Design a protein around this ligand. Structure first.
Ligand SMILES: CN1CCC(c2ccc(Nc3ncc4ccc(-c5cnn(C)c5)cc4n3)cc2)CC1
Ligand SMILES: CN1CCC(c2ccc(Nc3ncc4ccc(-c5cnn(C)c5)cc4n3)cc2)CC1
Lengths: 285, 265
């Protein structure tokens, strides 16, 4: 039920949390109670279909999972869609590791297991996250791990159609690849393996190499998937987790459900207490 | 070469861009050329593709952060530039254009190349009535983000797309409708809607609008080039045996007539 009210009548915007081409995300406060929410402001276009928006917003509402940022309703006011979500007080793992430094292997194991639970849920609903990275993994003050449920409207769709070009002369099989864009559900599994190296080393592999060079090497017959830099620092289970998630061929890359049975994320002692320790380090180094 | 093209050519007028393409003249002989102002592997493959229906490559210059590709000049510009003044082309003119484009495409496809952008705007016409197919664009492509977390199959599509050689055959069938009607099918429909409709099951490949105006051979040419499944779409060599492009009387004289109409409509 997309409310046709201005969210600024119920919420005070307190802080710009992030943003990009799509719009902005804010920390907001209920003017009456004082509860904290995250409000995602998405710029609509005049050509965007309301039917598609109602379909996406209805499925978003019924897509309940503990590792997915909670949906609290949405507002549609003056060409702007505002999605109201649960606020995660610590921000992203990128926000955290930029102060705390690299995460321990047990902390990464817990993060990976929670992300894999969220990914198994999305993939069961025929969804693809498409952007697994430290910046997109949220942590609340309880040490819990959340992914946000998402690009197919407004300025992000306008920009993607500008990359694709005019479609009038495109054969249908070219149009189909331009819609999909290489994304398949197993691309989130590769992205999680890169994110695990990112949490361990504060950068993804090849961060200092020019993006075109990276893209080129990736598309060459015989590309070597990246690995952890310090071998001795990490267990054999962590090296193997990176090895199987970074399987080059998507036909051989394990699914999220299969990855949930891997030794690294199946081990005992993986709980939010590991992240409460990380959050303590954030307060006082 | 590592010379300033200013030493070998006299710049005449700007033709277009979005780098830039110019019209230029040989300071000694008086030959006219097109200079594209924008590597070793791309230039070698470019130099190697030599067919009569492909814009001739005359060398390249690298001077002061600028690559200049010297090509043969086609005095009349593109078929889109022409039909915007002359109006729709006759069936015989389209048959000749399609045959010449198919010859060029058979040549590119034999060299394991894909044109990727067959359309009226990309088909060049010289003053002789002949038909030819021919930095910041790469920086813009990279800007559309960080690839560090990308799976390899995502990186491959971000650098190749869904392009296959038979996509040029579908594009030529759309271009034939474009030359006949002054617009490709669905030109007034939003691009996302077009993309969406194309990826549906009950999708009907487009057709010519006024049935009686065109021969059965032209409707059949549109029918086979616009075969939905690429596994069933005919190759350029196969299309060269189709009755529309095999008919006698297809010659540059048809386009010299079109060019005369462009001077004095
Ligand atoms: C210096 N500061 C700057 C501020 C930093 C911060 C950043 C985020 C938060 N919380 C937070 N909660 C819930 C959220 C729900 C959804 C989103 C969402 C959906 N899409 N996209 C792109 C972001 C983002 C969400 N974000 C708190 C703090 C910390 C470090
Ligand atoms: C009103 N006028 C404006 C001027 C218009 C014109 C436009 C072009 C020409 N010739 C001409 N020849 C040869 C060419 C070879 C290559 C290219 C190339 C490669 N890449 N890219 C983007 C363009 C372009 C080439 N162009 C003559 C005329 C006509 C209509």
């Amino acid at each position: 039920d997309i409310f046709n009210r201005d969210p600024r009548d119920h919420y005070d915007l307190l802080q710009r949390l992030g943003g990009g081409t799509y719009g902005e995300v804010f920390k907001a406060r209920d003017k009456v109670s004082g509860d904290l929410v995250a409000l995602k402001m998405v710029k609509m276009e005049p050509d965007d279909d309301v039917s598609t928006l109602q379909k996406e917003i209805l499925i978003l509402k019924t897509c309940r999972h503990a590792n997915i940022v909670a949906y609290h309703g949405s507002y549609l006011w003056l060409q702007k869609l505002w999605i109201c979500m649960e606020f995660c007080g610590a921000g992203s793992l990128q926000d955290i590791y930029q102060v705390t430094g690299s995460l321990s292997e047990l902390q990464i194991s817990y993060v990976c297991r929670e992300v894999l639970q969220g990914l198994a849920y999305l993939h069961s609903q025929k969804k693809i996250h498409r952007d697994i990275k430290g910046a997109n993994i949220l942590i609340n003050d309880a040490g819990e791990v959340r992914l946000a449920d998402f690009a197919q409207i407004g300025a992000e769709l306008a920009r993607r159609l500008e990359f694709i070009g005019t479609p009038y002369w495109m054969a249908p099989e070219v149009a189909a690849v331009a819609l999909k864009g290489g994304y398949n559900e197993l691309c989130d599994i590769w992205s999680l393996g890169i994110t695990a190296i990112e949490l361990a080393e504060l950068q993804p592999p090849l961060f200092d190499v020019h993006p075109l060079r990276v893209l080129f090497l990736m598309t060459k017959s015989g590309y070597q998937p990246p690995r952890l830099k310090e071998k001795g620092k990490w267990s054999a289970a962590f090296h193997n987790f990176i090895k199987v998630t970074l399987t080059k061929s998507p036909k051989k890359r394990p699914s999220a459900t299969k990855m949930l049975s891997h030794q690294l994320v199946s081990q005992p002692g993986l709980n939010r207490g590991l992240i409460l320790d990380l959050l303590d380090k954030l307060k006082n180094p």
